[PDB]
Amino acid sequence: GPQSFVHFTKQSLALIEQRIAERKSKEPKPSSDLEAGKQLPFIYGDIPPGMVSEPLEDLDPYYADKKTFIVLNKGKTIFRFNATPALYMLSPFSPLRRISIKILVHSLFSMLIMCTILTNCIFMTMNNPPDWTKNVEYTFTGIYTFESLVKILARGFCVGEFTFLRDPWNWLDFVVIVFAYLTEFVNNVSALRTFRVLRALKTISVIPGLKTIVGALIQSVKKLSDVMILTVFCLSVFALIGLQLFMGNLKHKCFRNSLENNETLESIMNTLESEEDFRKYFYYLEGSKDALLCGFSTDSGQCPEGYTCVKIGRNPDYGYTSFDTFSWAFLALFRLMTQDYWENLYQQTLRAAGKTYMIFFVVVIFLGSFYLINLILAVVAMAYEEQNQANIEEAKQKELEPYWIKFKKCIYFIVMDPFVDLAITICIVLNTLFMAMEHHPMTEEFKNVLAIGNLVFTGIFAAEMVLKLIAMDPYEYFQVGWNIFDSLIVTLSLVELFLLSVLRSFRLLRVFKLAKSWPTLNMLIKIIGNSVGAFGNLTLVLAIIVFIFAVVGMQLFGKSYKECVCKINDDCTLPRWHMNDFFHSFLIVFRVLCGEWIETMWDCMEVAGQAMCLIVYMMVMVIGNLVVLNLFLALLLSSFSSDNLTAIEEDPDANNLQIAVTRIKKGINYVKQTLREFILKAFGKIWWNIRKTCYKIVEHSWFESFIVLMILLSSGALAFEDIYIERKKTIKIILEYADKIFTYIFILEMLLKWIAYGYKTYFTNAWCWLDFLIVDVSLVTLVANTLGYSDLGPIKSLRTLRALRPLRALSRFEGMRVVVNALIGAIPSIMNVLLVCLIFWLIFSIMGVNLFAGKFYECINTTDGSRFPASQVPNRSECFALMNVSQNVRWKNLKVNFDNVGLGYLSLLQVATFKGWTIIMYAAVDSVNVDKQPKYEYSLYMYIYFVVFIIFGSFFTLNLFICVIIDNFNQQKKKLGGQDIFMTEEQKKYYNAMKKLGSKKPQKPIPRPGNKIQGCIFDLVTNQAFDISIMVLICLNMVTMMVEKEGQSQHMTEVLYWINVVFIILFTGECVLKLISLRHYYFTVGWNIFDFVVVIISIVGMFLADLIETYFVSPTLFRVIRLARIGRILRLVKGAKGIRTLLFALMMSLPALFNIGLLLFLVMFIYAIFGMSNFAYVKKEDGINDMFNFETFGNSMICLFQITTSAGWDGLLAPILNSKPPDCDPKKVHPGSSVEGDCGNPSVGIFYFVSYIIISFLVVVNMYIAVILENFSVATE
């Protein structure tokens, strides 16, 4: 009804209740389109003018029977009400109620209540409000109170379907105003103040379109039920394992053996309170809070001579890193799963209980910190996608339902499309590369050249702006969106010229002007614009959440961090990362979002209570991470296919570079012919039998097996060559002679292949080229060895290429071949994405080197490492005048900094990875000017550089990479038929078969044995409650395993032993009765097999454990055999179904990750040998110490496994860059060996670690893809 608008009058009141009167005298869903909040449809057209914002008749047929009315805005918005008097007082024509509606149905109302809130927040941002802010507080309270009031006497308190209190979001305004009145009248208050924070959550109510956003987040969380259950379960199981193994281990410290005046461990340990007191009796490395660990084994930490390894004291890191009680094990393994500074746990456990406990930390990082995270990112994605899909479907369905003129035209013909634009772009690239040549120790001449260049370029760009501005009118000139940009840039240039350092660097964004001829940069601009465009509300939500958590953290913990600073920092001054300001609170919340959430949490707890710190941090992390994952996913899927679908042609107005390039092939090809025409115008069977033999032999599986075994022996033989080789002299001789034999066999290999396949086919295959190069290396090395040229420079740096010997393995292992082909098919694309990322990071790097370059120098008292305070010695000359009279003073940089664009790229690689960025921010935000001693946070507001950087380079670039990888993989899968690209042909059979195990629904129900007694046993076991009970008692046993702690008591140990015995007895009994029931059928059920096995292992374990402890002595074997019990828990999996399917997905996916694991192991082997050869003699520093280093194959594989997750790689890399003393010493003696010098080579070191981190990143991306596609395949099935 387009023209059915009737003022809701006395007759409306009159008519309605006799309708409802006959309904109650005689005793369909409402129009979704017309339901309030949305917009009025176009079917009713326009509204009579005076009828707007008035009580109107009800349109929806469903509500037509009942007694309501609707009021419509000038913005065509539906506001429905109920015609019952408000509080039985305000009838629909009471004059107060009319004007109340007029306010409520008015946009300026929202504008006011929003302009108040967005200033209330800015008032929240202050930690110590001045006395004048009481007035503001009171006025704010008044505005909220009466703006809620205008709701009440219009909407209605509680007597209606539509009445105020009904909407959940009008709960919050009510509660805040009543609490504000309360606290104002009951007059610590910090908890009450936290609810004033709650005000700024009305933001979500006021601005439209976030109601839907938060609804979406809620419905998307609703799906992560079973994954969170399984995360809790798996974390708990590994927590039990870690509890059993390491209970009390991290409490080891080295205690002096020479105590004077009759004391003991106990006698001291009762009377000790200091760090100094603990230093006089334990072993503390220089500059550390915790006591050095130690272990009772040969593969553990070694106490200094004079100390003995004892278990006493407090656990490390204030006492919070432990495996002592179930809860602390949960905390430690959650820290492992989120990989938050897990490498310190890695080193602490290894130093405590030994290196051979590396297997534990491997099984978890592979499973816990990968398989859970993927299951989460896959579930969230899968949800999101369903909603985007339904949304798109719905949107679609709904849509479906005189002289001036002379020279201006002259200049316009001098717009010449093919060429002037190319001149400008080459000017752009020449500028950017000219501005990438700053550096700190830059001479005055370079300074001059750079300045002059900047000036010439500025001039050219400006000239083209003014020329085209006179060319065509500003009315259209300022319509082209790129035009506004250029004008802006020229204006900025002029302002810079006539006056900050940051202002020098807005001439950089011209690099985007190449995006016209650059399609991948167009993709990137599509992401950047999208995040402020069609998904800008979700980014606003992220901003809101960060604000809320920032201010809550400040309100709760702010004072604490100031009364209790001495607990967390020795100098009685606030730490670096604290919650006493709004800005620093924001920084800590940002850091929690990036993923480094313990250390701040330890400080938090140490000053302000474990419970409130824990609840906040866990909540911050979860909520934030969820919202960020949702943003990432959205952008990725929008940009994936929903961004554009090639609706328009490739550069519809053919690209000016493509117009230009035609004039090039017009030029180059024609002129190529003009110089061409002018220059011509001016001027027997036996050999084939040998071939077929050699062909036949090399194909034979005996030969191939021989060569594979040969390759494995070479690979292994490489690993013996370490630092300790001079000790094992016989092995030294054997290895030389075996290497000689090996090269012999391998050249015979070459000769047979050459004659078999022929030179051609052998030279046109990649693997044969690889082997050819390798055996060439071997041959040259051998000959030079036998000719005495065995020590002359490069022929010793050529030997270190023996480490490439394993690279022959890839050509023999199928899985390795299939992974290599899959990863090589996607390099072409990855290269374009990488190059965009590089130019972008180059813009950031020039911003950096302009802001910071040359200012990280600082005097350092090298004995302790404390920079001299800027009260005395504020500058260079002072640092030198100090060294000449004092000592151990140096003007020392950071070695990874911004002194030029290259080191800039390096330091940015550190920041974007969060592994070592902390020292860069610290030494940057301290900066003053070149040749100046820094001051503590003297430039505090440089952290925003890092925040912006972090945001773009880690968040958008990661998105871009992931998008391209997925796209290519889709290509690499779709083209071949859906085949998994990580599985060999036999692996495919296995997978297909393993799939049919997950598809069998029915089985015969085990006919019932005849005899009455066993029949009763049968109908007992097959009853539903039997299993329910058994799993209840399984949980009752799991808790019996949880209740243990550290040093509990003698009595408790026995009493738990006895409960354990009773459970064991019941379980064994169930098993026996079950067997009796399904006689001879027990084994038809794989789960029952598992069960038999566990019962048996468990009985065995109890008995064996008893035996060993009683007669033998073996603590470690005792603990490792008491782990048989853990199997009893794994039967929780039986009853579940939300977990079985997920673990069956992991079982499905296993072989692919097997092949990537093989490739990763081979790469780790090669890099291990490389490290063994080069960095076995570097100094011992940040990451390289007495236990984690490259001196041996075990140590090097430990270090590389650690940085496979990219963890702590800056720490290892830092002691390799040192060179040219005083950083190192090149004339060290190194007893027991002839090598000299103790510092490494920067270039090879940088190559080593950078190369490794990209390759590790690429293989783990492949692992991600494998598990994620497996989950999609299982879930949609």
Partner 1 sequence: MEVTVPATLNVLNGSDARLPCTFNSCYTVNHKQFSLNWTYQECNNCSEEMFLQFRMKIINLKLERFQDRVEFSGNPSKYDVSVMLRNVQPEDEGIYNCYIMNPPDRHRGHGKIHLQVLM
Partner 2 sequence: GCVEVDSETEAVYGMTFKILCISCKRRSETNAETFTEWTFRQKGTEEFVKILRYENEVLQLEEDERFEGRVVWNGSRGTKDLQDLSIFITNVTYNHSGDYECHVYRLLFFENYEHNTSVVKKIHIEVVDKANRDMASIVSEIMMYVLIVVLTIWLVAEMIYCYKKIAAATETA
Ligand X SMILES: CCCCCCCC/C=C\CCCCCCCC(=O)OC[C@H](COP(=O)(O)OCC[N+](C)(C)C)OC(=O)CCCCCCC/C=C\CCCCCCCC
Ligand Y SMILES: *[C@@H]1O[C@H](CO)[C@@H](O)[C@H](O)[C@H]1NC(C)=O
Ligand Z SMILES: CCCCCCCCCCCCCCCCCCOC[C@@H](O)COP(=O)(O)OCC[N+](C)(C)C
Ligand U SMILES: *[C@@H]1O[C@H](CO)[C@@H](O[C@@H]2O[C@H](CO)[C@@H](O)[C@H](O)[C@H]2NC(C)=O)[C@H](O)[C@H]1NC(C)=O
**Which one of 3, 187, 641, 884 is in contact with ligand Y (CB under 6 A)?**
884
| Sites for partner 1 among residues 519-578 (CB under 8 A) | 560, 563-564, 566-567, 572
Q: How far is the CB of 603 from partner 1 (least distance, A)?
A: 13
**Residue 1158 binds which entry of ligand Z, partner 1, ligand Y, none, with Cβ cut-offs from 5 to 8 Å by kind?**
ligand Z
Instruction: Answer yes or no whether residue 1043 interacts with ligand X by CB under 6 A.
Output: no
Give whichever of 864 and 1277 is closer to ligand U, judged by the CB atom. Answer: 864
Q: How far is the CB of 564 from partner 1 (least distance, A)?
A: 4
**Residue 734 binds which entry of ligand Y, ligand X, partner 2, none, with Cβ cut-offs from 5 to 8 Å by kind?**
partner 2
Give whichever of 108 and 285 is closer to partner 2, judged by the CB atom. Answer: 285
If phi > 0 it is left, if psi is from -120 to 50 it is alpha, else beta; for residue 758 that is: left
Give whichever of 335 and 895 is closer to ligand Z, judged by the CB atom. Answer: 895
Structure tokens at 1219: 């060179």
Q: What is the CA radius of gyration of the chain?
A: 37
**Residue 560 binds which entry of ligand U, partner 1, partner 2, none, with Cβ cut-offs from 5 to 8 Å by kind?**
partner 1
**Chain breaks after residues in the chain, where C lies over 2.5 Å from next N:** 27, 187, 401, 499, 683
Instruction: Answer yes or no whether residue 877 interacts with ligand X by CB under 6 A.
Output: no
Site string for ligand X, 975-1014 (x = CB under 6 A): ----------------------x-----------------
d(CA 37, CA 104): 13
Give whichever of 1056 and 1130 is closer to ligand X, judged by the CB atom. Answer: 1130
d(CA 1136, CA 1143): 11
Query: Which DSSP helix (H) or strand (E) runs through 827?
Result: helix 827-851
d(CA 697, CA 756): 9
Q: Which residue is associated with the tokens 């009021």?
A: 71
Q: How far is the CB of 263 from ligand Y (least distance, A)?
A: 8
If phi > 0 it is left, if psi is from -120 to 50 it is alpha, else beta; for residue 978 that is: left
Piece of 618-626, 1153-1161, 1257-1265, 1267-1275 that binds ligand X (CB under 6 A): 618-626
d(CA 507, CA 457): 11
CA distances from 1159 to 695, 814, 828, 1136, 1185 (A): 29, 11, 21, 35, 29
Q: How far is the CB of 562 from partner 1 (least distance, A)?
A: 10
CA distances from 1025 to 352, 1012, 1020, 1043 (A): 46, 21, 9, 27
**Which one of 213, 337, 607, 826 is in contact with partner 1 (CB under 8 A)?**
607
d(CA 511, CA 428): 7
Give whichever of 18 and 693 is closer to partner 2, judged by the CB atom. Answer: 693
Instruction: Answer yes or no whether residue 263 interacts with partner 1 by CB under 8 A.
Output: no
Would you tell me which residues interact with partner 2 (CB under 8 A)?
A: 256, 258, 279-280, 283-285, 302-306, 685, 689-690, 692-693, 696-697, 723-724, 726-727, 730, 733-734, 737, 740-741, 744-745, 748, 1177, 1180, 1186, 1191, 1229-1233
**Residues counted in the chain:** 1277
Instruction: Answer yes or no whether residue 284 interacts with ligand U by CB under 6 A.
Output: no
**Residue 607 binds which entry of ligand Y, ligand U, partner 1, none, with Cβ cut-offs from 5 to 8 Å by kind?**
partner 1
d(CA 567, CA 598): 17
What SS3 class is residue 80?
Answer: strand
Query: Which DSSP helix (H) or strand (E) runs through 879?
Result: helix 876-883
Instruction: Answer yes or no whether residue 1003 interacts with ligand Y by CB under 6 A.
Output: no
Structure tokens at 296: 């009772």
| Sites for ligand X among residues 707-736 (CB under 6 A) | none
Four-point Cα dihedral 18, 19, 24, 27, nearest 10:
140
| Sites for ligand U among residues 852-891 (CB under 6 A) | 861, 863-864, 874-875, 877-878, 886
**Residue 200 binds which entry of ligand U, ligand Z, ligand X, none, with Cβ cut-offs from 5 to 8 Å by kind?**
none
Q: How far is the CB of 220 from ligand X (least distance, A)?
A: 16
CA distances from 42 to 398, 619, 1270 (A): 13, 45, 47
Query: Which DSSP helix (H) or strand (E) runs through 406?
Result: helix 403-413
Give whichever of 17 and 1236 is closer to ligand Y, judged by the CB atom. Answer: 1236
Four-point Cα dihedral 608, 610, 612, 613, nearest 10:
80
Structure tokens at 246: 């390491």
d(CA 993, CA 1013): 41
Q: How far is the CB of 41 from ligand Z (least distance, A)?
A: 54
d(CA 116, CA 101): 21
| Cα–Cα nearest to 435, from 952, 844, 906, 925 | 844
In sequence order, the 6+-apart residues with CB closer than 8 A to the CB of 722 are 1172, 1176, 1191, 1192, 1193
Instruction: Answer yes or no whether residue 623 interacts with ligand X by CB under 6 A.
Output: no
Instruction: Answer yes or no whether residue 258 interacts with ligand Y by CB under 6 A.
Output: no
d(CA 257, CA 1202): 35
Structure tokens at 385: 């996608």
Give whichever of 571 and 650 is closer to partner 1, judged by the CB atom. Answer: 571
**Which one of 3, 128, 262, 397 is in contact with ligand Y (CB under 6 A)?**
262
Instruction: Report how many residues bind ligand U under the rule CB under 6 A.
Output: 8
Give whichever of 101 and 1216 is closer to ligand Z, judged by the CB atom. Answer: 1216
Give whichever of 724 and 1154 is closer to partner 2, judged by the CB atom. Answer: 724
Give whichever of 187 and 871 is closer to ligand U, judged by the CB atom. Answer: 871
Q: What is the DSSP string of 1225-1262?
A: -TT---TTSS-------HHHHHHHHHHHHHHHHHHHHH
Piece of 855-863, 868-876, 962-970, 1086-1094 that binds ligand X (CB under 6 A): 1086-1094
Give whichever of 813 and 1248 is closer to ligand X, judged by the CB atom. Answer: 1248
Give whichever of 445 and 864 is closer to ligand U, judged by the CB atom. Answer: 864
What SS3 class is residue 774?
Answer: helix
Asked whether 949 and 959 are in contact (CB, 8 A), the reply is no
**Residue 874 binds which entry of ligand U, ligand Z, partner 1, none, with Cβ cut-offs from 5 to 8 Å by kind?**
ligand U
Q: How far is the CB of 693 from partner 2 (least distance, A)?
A: 5
Instruction: Answer yes or no whether residue 935 interacts with ligand U by CB under 6 A.
Output: no
Would you tell me which residues interact with ligand Z (CB under 6 A)?
A: 436-437, 439, 441, 712, 715-716, 719-720, 722, 724, 766, 797, 800, 806, 809, 820-821, 824, 838, 842, 900-902, 1158, 1161-1163, 1165-1166, 1170, 1173-1174, 1192-1193, 1241-1244, 1246-1248, 1250-1251, 1254
Give whichever of 635 and 1216 is closer to partner 2, judged by the CB atom. Answer: 1216
Instruction: Report how many residues bind partner 1 under the rule CB under 8 A.
Output: 8
Asked whether 514 and 428 are in contact (CB, 8 A), the reply is yes
Instruction: Answer yes or no whether residue 794 interacts with ligand X by CB under 6 A.
Output: no
Tell me, what DSSP letter sits at residue 291? P
In sequence order, the 6+-apart residues with CB closer than 8 A to the CB of 1064 are 1098, 1099, 1102
Q: How far is the CB of 622 from ligand X (least distance, A)?
A: 6
List of residues contacting partner 1 (CB under 8 A): 273, 560, 563-564, 566-567, 572, 607
Binding positions for ligand Y, rule: CB under 6 A: 262, 884
Which residue ranges make up the site for ligand X (CB under 6 A)?
318-320, 325, 327-328, 330-331, 334, 610-611, 614-615, 618-619, 622, 834, 899-900, 902-903, 905-906, 909, 997, 1084-1086, 1089-1090, 1093-1094, 1123, 1126-1127, 1242, 1246, 1250, 1254
Which positions lie near ligand U, rule CB under 6 A?
A: 861, 863-864, 874-875, 877-878, 886
